[PDB]
Design a protein around this ligand. Structure first.
Ligand SMILES: NC(=O)c1ccc[n+]([C@@H]2O[C@H](COP(=O)([O-])OP(=O)(O)OC[C@H]3O[C@@H](n4cnc5c(N)ncnc54)[C@H](OP(=O)(O)O)[C@@H]3O)[C@@H](O)[C@H]2O)c1
Ligand SMILES: NC(=O)c1ccc[n+]([C@@H]2O[C@H](COP(=O)([O-])OP(=O)(O)OC[C@H]3O[C@@H](n4cnc5c(N)ncnc54)[C@H](OP(=O)(O)O)[C@@H]3O)[C@@H](O)[C@H]2O)c1
Ligand SMILES: O=C(O)c1cc(/N=N/c2ccc(O)c(C(=O)O)c2)ccc1O
Ligand SMILES: O=C(O)c1cc(/N=N/c2ccc(O)c(C(=O)O)c2)ccc1O
Lengths: 206, 207
């Protein structure tokens, strides 16, 4: 296929695990970056290549980005709402590696709160949102072919492929299943129509 | 007050520096910049009147930049430092000494809104630069110079509005200021004494 080799950052995470499973089923040759302490589960889908290391190390990000057709970014801090720069600094490393290695397409997940009135963002989520804002600025200013995926609440509902994709604004539902979010990140590999846009995927599960 | 025409800008090649410099040149200021590498200044459009090539850590280079000015704008930063660093505070000591030696009495300097919030708001990677912002702020406050402390939140890329809010000695209502609005505010601080001795938090809601 046109896009065949992809790097996934955050493959062990809630959305990353289903994105990886869908990508392997769809025939992608997937490279993952995993932290040493948190490898992919034994019984699950196996990627083609594993780099062990940290997104905060340029060397490890370089190893993961080299030779790819595109990059998916599903970094996050799991339940931890503390102040952080891991997403934005990870994105700085990813941008630098993509430029050095001639990779252009990056589909990266931040949050629908980037499209909210800031007075309404829940204060408990402001520290994480501040880093999503930093991350989105890094990716927007890079000049790369960047699809800004900005989901609302990530739920455990099924894969449908039937969700709404709202461009450059908030969508009509406040949930997307983790499986649909991963499906959309992969869909963004096969089209240029979302490049340079913010995208809000959402659905009503019924 | 005293009419400011000549200014030095430190950090003029940075993201806020570049637009503060452009806006200052367009408004008519006679601008002197201290730059480590003159190729980082734009070759077209508005250009400063005077370029000193050198380093804020070298007292002589700072002295040459501050000589003859009416006021000083400080937009230094060290984005890549994540462990203890003293570049900004040592630069500020050199700036203060040069201002005292040359009779320059007005300094408008950028640190960050972390200095207005609980220290646990600081991401761990940013503790070292925040600690050095605190040292720089203390150097400027203890100098006896007329000092406006500008303590912005996230610096964004939205177009200049001139319509942002400034909150005095406290935090305002948004957590972003465009680099263009931040630069506009630094220049506004040259036209008035009202912020002298205060901390200022510029912020705005864009679109
Ligand atoms: N409702 C929601 O939960 C919601 C809504 C909107 C937006 N979001 C945002 O959507 C994104 C994805 O959320 P999610 O729930 O799928 O993610 P998650 O479960 O928090 O997974 C985060 C992933 O990032 C990896 N990671 C973290 N730090 C890393 C580091 N230093 N180096 C390498 N990898 C690192 C994690 O690896 P480890 O296995 O080593 O931890 C894991 O694979 C997040 O940014 C989140 O804030 C979430
Ligand atoms: N980014 C944010 O959202 C944010 C938020 C709050 C506060 N801040 C703080 O706001 C301030 C301005 O940030 P910014 O992003 O506009 O700055 P920046 O883009 O990082 O620019 C830093 C400037 O300082 C110069 N500089 C650094 N070391 C120097 C040295 N030894 N001698 C002479 N010049 C030196 C740099 O010169 P070169 O071009 O030669 O490197 C550049 O002109 C910083 O102190 C920052 O910590 C940033
Ligand atoms: O731990 C968490 O609770 C958490 C929640 C997050 N985001 N939640 C969102 C984001 C955007 C939204 O629009 C909505 C919504 O509409 O409810 C919810 C992100 C990281 C987290 O760790
Ligand atoms: O290296 C950098 O990029 C850097 C970034 C800084 N950011 N400071 C703040 C302060 C308050 C805020 O609210 C926010 C925000 O909301 O993003 C950011 C400070 C020093 C640095 O060296």
């Amino acid at each position: 296929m046109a896009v065949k080799k992809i790097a996934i950052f955050g493959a062990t995470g809630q959305t990353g695990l289903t994105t990886l499973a869908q990508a392997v089923q769809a025939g992608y040759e997937v490279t993952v970056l995993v932290r040493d302490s948190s490898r992919l589960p034994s019984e699950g889908p196996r990627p083609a290549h594993v780099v062990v290391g940290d997104v905060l190390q340029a060397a490890d990000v370089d190893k993961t980005v080299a030779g790819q057709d595109a990059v998916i970014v599903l970094l996050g801090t799991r339940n931890d709402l503390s102040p952080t720069t891991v997403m934005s600094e990870g994105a700085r490393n990813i941008v630098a590696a993509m430029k050095a290695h001639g990779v252009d397409k990056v589909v990266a997940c931040t949050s629908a709160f980037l499209l909210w009135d800031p007075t309404k963002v829940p204060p408990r989520l402001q520290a994480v949102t501040d880093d999503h804002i930093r991350m989105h600025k890094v990716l927007r200013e890079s000049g790369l072919k960047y699809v800004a995926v900005m989901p609302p609440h990530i739920g455990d509902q099924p894969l449908t492929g039937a969700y709404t994709v709202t461009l450059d604004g908030r969508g009509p539902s406040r949930v997307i299943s983790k499986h649909d979010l991963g499906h959309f990140m992969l869909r963004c590999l096969t089209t240029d129509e979302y490049d340079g846009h913010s995208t809000y995927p959402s659905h009503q599960y019924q």
